[PDB]
Structures are given as C-alpha cells and as structure tokens.
Amino acid sequence: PFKEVSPNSFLLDDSHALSQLLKKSYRWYSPVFSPRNVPRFADVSSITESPETLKAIRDFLVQRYRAMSPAPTHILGFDARGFLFGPMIAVELEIPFVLMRKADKNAGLLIRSEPYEKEYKEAAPEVMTIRYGSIGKGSRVVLIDDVLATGGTALSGLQLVEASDAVVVEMVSILSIPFLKAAEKIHSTANSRYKDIKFISLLSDDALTEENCGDSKNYTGPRVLSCGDVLAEHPH
Amino acid sequence: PFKEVSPNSFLLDDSHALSQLLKKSYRWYSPVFSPRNVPRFADVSSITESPETLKAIRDFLVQRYRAMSPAPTHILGFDARGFLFGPMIAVELEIPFVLMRKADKNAGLLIRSEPYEKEYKEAAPEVMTIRYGSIGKGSRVVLIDDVLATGGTALSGLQLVEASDAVVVEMVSILSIPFLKAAEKIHSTANSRYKDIKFISLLSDDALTEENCGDSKNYTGPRVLSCGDVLAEHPH
C-alpha cells in the first residue's frame, strides 16, 4: 500500500510487486545519451516497451479507482507522457480522458492557467490549457503524468481543475524526484491553499541505481544516426 | 470490413458500428476556434472524452490484431496523438509500444529519419527519431496515429521501420483526409518503393459534416480565457 513520506504525499511500499517491477524495468540516461541536461533522465519508453510493466501499472490503478468511493468522474493527463497512461485506465473505468495542452495545441474555447514566478536560475514554466467545459461542475478529477519533477505542470493541473468548480481527487505519477520537493512546495505555496491535494507515486528515483543506466558503454560516436548510415550496415 | 478506396488503401465500411460512432462523436473547429489554420480542425479530445467511442476503437483493433497471422510484434505510435491510442492496444496484445519523437524528446542512441523536399507553399516537414534497437530485426510493426493528413510523418515512420530491418504491417489512422492524397503520394514516391505499404482508416473526413462543428455559435469573445476571469464568474 501507499505510505506517507510527507504530509499528504504517498509512495507505494517498495515491497509491492509493481514497485519491484518498475525498479527492474526503468532505464535512465546521462546528458551524453539524453536530450535534456539533468544528471539522470528517466526514459518512459523503458516502461511502455515493457508489456508486463505496462499491464501492471494498468491493473493497479484500475483496481484502485474502482474500489474508491466516490469514484472519479474524469482523468486529466499531461502533454505528452501523461497521454501514455491516462487512456488505458479511462477506457476501463469508462470515464472521459481530458487533455491538458498548450493553447497552440488545444481546440475550442480554452482556459489558460496562471503560472508562478521562477525562483532564479532560469527554467521558466509553461502556460497550460484545457477546453472550457471539458470538466463539468462537481467533477472528481484524477491528474496523471509519468514523472513529478518540479511540480510546475501539476500546478497548472490543479489551477485548471480548481477554476472549473471541480475537485482534484489526487495527482498520480509513475516516478517522482523527491529532491526537487514538488509535493512540499505545492502544499505550502500561497498560504497552503493546496494543502489538501493528495500526491501518489509508484516509485521514487532514489530507488533507481547504476543497474538502471541505459548509456552504451565505451561508445564514442554520435547520439543521432541518420537512416542511411544504418541501412548500409547490413546487406539489403 | 475494410474496402479498398485506392490501391493498398482501405476504409472501414461506413455501415459498421464504429464508423457510425466516430461519425457521431467526432468534433471539428474552424480557424476561429482552433490553433491551426485549416478549414476544419478535428479535435481528438472529442474521441478520448467519449468513453464509448474510445472503448470501441480499442475493441476493434485488438480483435483485428489477435485474429491476424502472423501477429504484430510492435506498435509504433506518433508524437503525440498516436500516444493516446497506441498503449491501450499494446497492453492487450502484450507487445511493446515504441515512441517516434523528435531527437530533442527521445533518449538513448537514436535513428533520425530523412524527410523529403517540400513541394512549394512552405509547410516544411519534421525529422523524427526512434531509439536504435527499439525495433529488432524481423519485427512486424503496426504504425498508428490519430489523423493521416499529408503523410509526412507516416513516411518517417516507414523509413524508420525500414531502416531497422523490420516490416510495416500497416499504417492505421482513426481519421483520414483523402483530399491530401497521402496514401497515393506515398505509394508512388521514389519509384513506388512503398507501394506495398497498406493503409487503413476508421473514418474519412468526407463523413464529417456541419453537425460535427464544435464552434460556439454567436460567440464574440476571446478563444483563451485566464483562470481568474473564470473563477469570479461563480461564488467561491
């Protein structure tokens, strides 16, 4: 089950089968093998390419939301990795799957979020939106993304659900980076108006070690190879 | 069943329940209510927000790929709408779901595609990639996206599957725009080297009429509203 690591922030007990499976299937990359500049970049492909792991995540959340009372009315996934997990859970619960995107990606009358100031060191957040009326009044929404890093996105999620006269059941993420203190900052930002928002993660990145690095060892070539340079490496 | 509209290009018979359901659930928007400049912009949210329609698409493709022999070994979805349909089919077939993304979105050693020249009128294509080794040799891959417009993306899909010493089972799309002649151009481009690639669509945009327009009538305000302007429109 989920244990409380900090006020209103829960982590699946590392003794569960899903925690052990995610820990076994997940893969990360150093800057030399990733497109972002972070010590370790967790690849979601390592999960979606793992049929067993993908089915496990699907079974656990579905079982969780069916057993819940009252049951959620909507699932709001984040662009774009949240799109990979949201739908398969929705189709089983038979509830709508709403998309949170940037204004230039979404259609219809939109509602843009109002992000906060960056606390120095660049990394300016993004304005996210959802179609006005996608989430009716009195709806119980489950927010979902693959990784909870800084929380900047989840916050737009909460503001959007709030602005729609709806309630956030909980923000669920596959993996979390406890060092970035997202659950903490959100729970106390602006006089703790989001204190009650529950956070659940299936795995902590503390659990990801060297055994999970996907970097090709001793490789001294480019990261991106063209299609042609690869075709001529085998008779065709 | 699927009927041949042009060489190696099939459309689900409009008499099927899925064709009637997609025709009923789909919604499009004019430039005034969309973020792109096209007469009609089809909103995928109109499908994912329709539990019944989403379950239908899921059941049909799963039934189709289980009955097939030999069965596909992988599902390759396109960033980002292809992510919404790919996973739920994969989890049932228990086969890996690979991601085709831009180099700055993907991790690991990548393989970039080699897109063709634009035939005037701007609209320059994109370089797509997949992780080298995500698709092994002799794999039978199913390509999937929500809409087949110009085909520029699907082509990267085909080139990537080709470059991996694998075969494309078929390129599946929910909706197609027959006017843009994508299936046609791909089937005859470069001496017809892609002549054998099969294309299947669940619906033609010819089927989408005025009854499917989501534009708010007589609305004379902005398209994007801030969260604050909306909160103060109800007691809280």
**For chain B, which residues make up each domain, given as ranges?**
1-236
Which run of H or E residues covers position B11?
strand B9-12
Which of B43, B45, B54 to mutate to probe the A interface, most A CBs <10 Å?
A: B45
The answer to whether B48 contacts A87, with C-beta atoms less than 8 Å apart, is yes
Q: Phi, psi (5° rounding) for residue B53?
A: -70, -40
Closest CB from B88, B103, B224 relative to A129: B224
Which residue does chain A place closest to B53, by CA atoms?
A: A91
Closest CB from B35, B109, B114 relative to A227: B114
Cβ pair A116, A123 in contact under 8 A:
no
The answer to whether B227 contacts A165, with C-beta atoms less than 8 Å apart, is no
Alpha-carbon distance B38 to B30, whole Å?
A: 7
Alpha-carbon distance B193 to A44, whole Å?
A: 33
Half-sphere exposure of B114 (CA within 13 A, CB side): 9
The answer to whether A87 contacts B223, with C-beta atoms less than 8 Å apart, is no
Q: Give residues with Cβ within 8 angstroms of B137, minimum separation 6.
A: B164, B165, B166
Amino acid (one-letter) located at B203: L
Residue A137 DSSP symbol: T
Which fold would CATH assign to domain A1-236?
Answer: Rossmann fold (3.40.50)
Instruction: Flag whether A43 is marked binding.
Output: no
Cβ pair B57, B202 in contact under 8 A:
yes
Closest CB from B41, B49, B94 relative to A98: B49
Torsion of the alpha carbons at B11, B14, B17 and B23, rounded to the nearest 10 = 90
Which run of H or E residues covers position A47?
helix A45-48
Cβ pair B116, B125 in contact under 8 A:
yes
Q: Which residue has the tokens 């709030």?
A: A162
Among A34, A70, A68, A50, CA closest to A223: A34
B148: tokens are 């087949």
Residue B226, number of CB atoms within 10 A of its CB: 15
Instruction: Flag whether A58 is marked binding.
Output: no
A98 in reach of chain B (CB within 8 A): yes
Alpha-carbon distance A199 to A219, whole Å?
A: 39
Which residue does chain A place closest to B106, by CA atoms?
A: A35
A216 in reach of chain B (CB within 8 A): yes
Which of B28, B53, B99 to mutate to probe the A interface, most A CBs <10 Å?
A: B99
Instruction: Flag whether A182 is marked binding.
Output: no
Cβ-count burial of A192 within 10 angstroms (0-12 exposed, 13-18 middle, 19+ buried)?
exposed
Q: B207 preceded by cis ω (within 30°)?
A: no
Instruction: Flag whether A59 is marked binding.
Output: no
Closest CB from A97, A108, A216 relative to B33: A108
What is the separation of C-alpha A32 from the centre of its chain, rounded to a whole number of angstroms?
A: 23
Which residue does chain B place closest to A160, by CA atoms?
A: B227
Q: How was this structure determined?
A: X-ray
A125: tokens are 């957040």
Alpha-carbon distance A214 to A233, whole Å?
A: 23
Alpha-carbon distance A106 to A129, whole Å?
A: 7
Strand-pairing partners, residue A28, are A42, A213
Strand order across the beta sheet in which A224-226 lies: A224-226, B110-112, B129-131
Which of B93, B158, B224, B229 to mutate to probe the A interface, most A CBs <10 Å?
A: B224
A106: tokens are 């979404």
Contacts of B108 in chain A (CB under 8 A): 29, 33, 43, 45, 214
DSSP string spanning B194-229? TTT--EEEEEEGGG--GGGB-PPTT--S-SEEEHHH
A38 in reach of chain B (CB within 8 A): no
What is the separation of C-alpha B41 from the centre of its chain, rounded to a whole number of angstroms?
A: 14
Which run of H or E residues covers position B116?
none
Q: Which residue has the tokens 């916050």?
A: A155
Alpha-carbon distance B54 to A154, whole Å?
A: 25
Amino acid (one-letter) located at B70: P
Closest CB from B34, B43, B91 relative to A58: B91
Contacts of B113 in chain A (CB under 8 A): 227
CA dist list (Å): B127 to A176, B73, B75, B152, B159: 31, 25, 20, 10, 11
Alpha-carbon distance A11 to A140, whole Å?
A: 21
The answer to whether A109 contacts B80, with C-beta atoms less than 8 Å apart, is no
A115 in reach of chain B (CB within 8 A): no
Closest CB from A52, A87, A107 relative to B33: A107
Q: Which residue has the tokens 């496990």?
A: A56
3-class DSSP state for residue A134? coil
The answer to whether B80 contacts A79, with C-beta atoms less than 8 Å apart, is yes
Q: Give residues with Cβ within 8 angstroms of B93, minimum separation 6.
A: B62, B65, B66, B71, B72, B75
A234 in reach of chain B (CB within 8 A): yes
A62 in reach of chain B (CB within 8 A): no
Contacts of A225 in chain B (CB under 8 A): 109-112, 132
